[PDB]
């Protein structure tokens, strides 16, 4: 009947009420989002006189434990002196409130999915895509610091936040699904649209899976639409193969879930486009004025520009994670010069 | 639309299909129960030719990691040579199936709540209650092994399983909420009816919380009704106070949440239906001098029982009776 | 031949050179101490403009991992804002230098064994002992903060430091042997003289083992001499029994190591085994007489001295006896020790 | 003064007495060896009627804690039901005895350094080297098993044991310095002669540092002498550079410790800082004696030591001594090498 003396629903979520003041300090304004972990609220800090985002974890042991891993990773990152850490949304403090762990973050404006919707799903400019890609490669380089070696594991537009609607600064958020290179047992990871082929295949995975997600995200930021909009894992792999063809034989040979998708030929599941015929050259509109032709003529949307972007994306979407382009090298690509 | 290639529902629980066969080995029979962790199914192991219970953990990282702790706690117990470990439901093995961690257990008949439902919540005899108590005390001694130091954290009739409807053998099940002794991390623990005063007061705690729970369970097994049926935390502490009086001053002086329930005076009293403190005497609840709960062992037997419960319901976790000493209690001789 | 490019000796200790400067910051002065962990040096911090003690961990994987536990415990403590934190030697920072983990502590003056030595092992006054007692009880109260639940595990005079040669402030140092309350990992813990009976008996233990050690240390600080100076574990437990009697049968009935020290007789009672070595009968070496409660204190040297009346000694005796309770479940806890009349 | 009731010396080592019987089961025979961890003894198991080797960990917390990692890693191995875990010295069981953690291993006969001494530091044949290299590659493949991902971190002749003078079997021993692949914790790792360049340069590293050690060891096994006998880290890097040349610039551009050994010129190129042979001029071709009858010319005309055979060996070693840990040969591919055909 009642849960947590009435403060929780039956999903161990705190019943969010606008206007409440948690710890007589944080005035709850509205809900930012919901997740399996719990909720995120926009709140005004009446002590520091600033807006914050507060992540209120479900009042359940499994979700508290997960959130404690996130806190530890965030606090581990914060001991690093590099300016590269500023591409990670900063955890200000945390506290227990009515049996919920609450994480207080610096508040950003909205996420890149909001941004895509604000473009009516037709993309942002290649120039803004470049600024994004350079920041994200820099964030991924930070995560790759050996003492960290952190895999985000859930990169997607929802988990990249824009600081200020009038600027291009972005940051990565939500390390609740993350792990360090030494803590990997879970093989069903990443959001499906952004799921790397080594994961779909059941292979060893490392930080390179985030680079695969980055490549998918960057294409979607410029076209406005998900690159690989799989409805399931077979559909996901088929939509990958439409663009990138049949994976290398040496990979599929060592792939435990190869025959889930392939016979090396593709197995049959309306009909999908043949392998490689959905060329990225055409998706990007390299010689045809960008996505939908809408970028014809705009500065920094030349053939030379688009070819450089296609090359970087293709290096990010390498089938093999041992030769997938790595953050240090990605930052030196001509696309950024 | 779909989840886990259609194998999962929207909460990422495996969609249980009665009669399905896993890996030409486990034939799913029926659902045993649901929960936050996921689901428990009755299944036949065609290879071993035995019935098993399979706990199918939800296909989500948070519950996978929790269930890993539970697996580790169970595999720690397996290593111990003592016969005491057999009062714990045995984990036979675990495997990944369609992205769900599956824990395979030995199969038991039903839980103590079902038993209480069977008796129309009139409780079982003191002799059956005596038998359950010694088994439970032995299970708690095993958890108290210093190298384990495991706190079950959710002892209750539903988590106590009956082997055979024709037998008194029982076992503790479900260590998904369990932890080993350590620095305090979680404060909102135990099921409310069975939650210890140290937890409610926000105080340090240890394996003694499980002994508190056991005392509530044992009285409930014999009366048929929960000892402290709180609708909320304040209702819970007040129903404890009805029976055991105001907590000792030295406890509330340290209790961080003392003033959620009590108020300190210039000279400790309750804050505001309830019976005055201590007037709901366990002497009357057990029917010690009046036959038993309602009207039907000896009065010496009931006095020995009452003494044992009162030691289990010691407000002080430092002096609450420990498993080794409870087994030496005259109630069992 | 050469170790760590010459910077280490064959023990992979850093070869300390007086007057070296590290990282254009720390001016190495002299060696403070040495242990199996490595070394402790006195150094001047040019940035904070203050003296520090730098613990230089051996350049060896096993000792590095050990010290990382110690770093974690200290940093876990540093997150607590209570004043009681003052009574732990403070970790200022840590760094890697020439493959050595270095822990930078506030510099204190000397340890309580030095102080004992400086009394020619005749003790300090009951007034100074009282001050030490109250501070150490506060330290233990801090360690018992539930989020911490830290057992020091090697409380002894050498691990209590005097802050300033002309003040009475003391602090607990060296958490390299420490652990948080949890499942039992270690059984051979605590220095022998200060080792609690539950450890000697191979029993479960918790934070109460540090209180036992404090009981022994406070007596020694006042008398000058260790209360239980065991040459080996059997001698240690016999000397304990001299003062406090046979441990209760319900403890011995559970102790895995009871038969190292005691015999269960045909009448069910426990008695000492003969030593394969002459002890007073159990409990006839009374702490009342060790302290000299009615005869002028230890060796009669406190007769007539302010603060050393029979009433003062009786309160001190009482607190110590609660600290030396055989049962860790009823041994006095730091909160209640601090309410004792000895401090009123 | 007395340590551990007289059972220990002042280094917290158990005082081993030949003959002692532990727990009416293990009869101690003699000291096999000793290291910073403690000691190894040969012992006879009466209850099981078999001879065993017991690693007696020092009675000190830091060594106890290190050895619990070792138990954990070994017990992880043991759970893998395969034939390849045989190339690891098998942990039979463990127990605490008089305050010492004790690891009970199957017992082997001697280590690779003893064999080298028995050759008079002239090396074993290319045929025996081939067999050892195949087993060692199979051990590294097992370690590379994804759920294990175990870096041994201290591959050296003393940690490779011969199973018996008449049986060609060798096994890897001592996982007390080992770790699973993960975030970087230690940087000063591996014995100096066998220490990989990525370690020397302070870079990220993974299981490939063991492959580097194996390449160094395999050469030493055939010649009898260490390939890179650095007296210190600079001497080490400079002897590596003697045989292999200056590392690639893209490594050095990212190496935190590059300027300990190399100077970056105004044209952006890397040279050695301020002795030695010029880089790349100490040819492995000439150390192996590909054309002159092998080491010392002693193998001239011997079966299995043709020009072709030595070229297959040079090539494989050179693949194991790839400066770049991403392109260094890996146990799977090392095992398909023609040198084993
Ligand atoms: C007004 O601010 C925001 C608005 C929005 N919304 C999303 C919905 N649309 C419809 C409106 C715009 C989205 C994010 C923000 N702000 C922001 N700043 C810091 C942290 C987080 C945060 C979000 N998530 C899922 C997290 C998970 N873990 C940790 C932290 C976070 N969010
Ligand atoms: C037919 O068998 C049973 C029937 C029942 N029911 C309960 C409902 N009433 C209405 C009918 C009778 C309940 C349990 C069993 N058997 C049994 N045996 C081993 C393990 C588990 C088990 C249950 N749970 C929640 C777990 C959680 N974690 C691990 C293991 C378990 N259960
Ligand atoms: C001049 O300063 C001192 C002198 C002395 N000596 C002891 C010998 N007698 C003969 C002279 C006086 C003893 C301690 C100090 N100072 C001090 N201050 C902070 C930390 C530590 C420290 C010591 N140890 C073993 C540690 C282990 N872990 C961590 C920290 C420490 N020491
Ligand atoms: C008589 O047997 C041996 C003799 C020798 N010696 C080495 C000196 N030369 C001069 C003589 C021959 C060397 C090894 C063995 N046997 C053997 N068998 C099992 C385990 C181990 C073992 C060695 N180490 C360092 C370990 C570290 N961790 C775990 C286990 C081990 N060793």
Author numbering:
A (entry chain D): 134 to 396, 403 to 408, 413 to 480
B (entry chain B): 134 to 400, 403 to 407, 414 to 437, 444 to 480
C (entry chain A): 134 to 409, 413 to 480
D (entry chain C): 134 to 407, 414 to 480
The publication says:
Aberrant activity of dual-specificity tyrosine phosphorylation-regulated kinases (DYRKs) has been linked to neurological disorders, diabetes, and cancer. DYRKs belong to a larger family of CMGC kinases, which includes cyclin-dependent kinases (C), mitogen-activated protein kinases (M), glycogen synthase kinases (G), and CDC-like kinases (C). DYRK1B and DYRK1A kinases share a sequence identity of 85% among the catalytic domain residues.
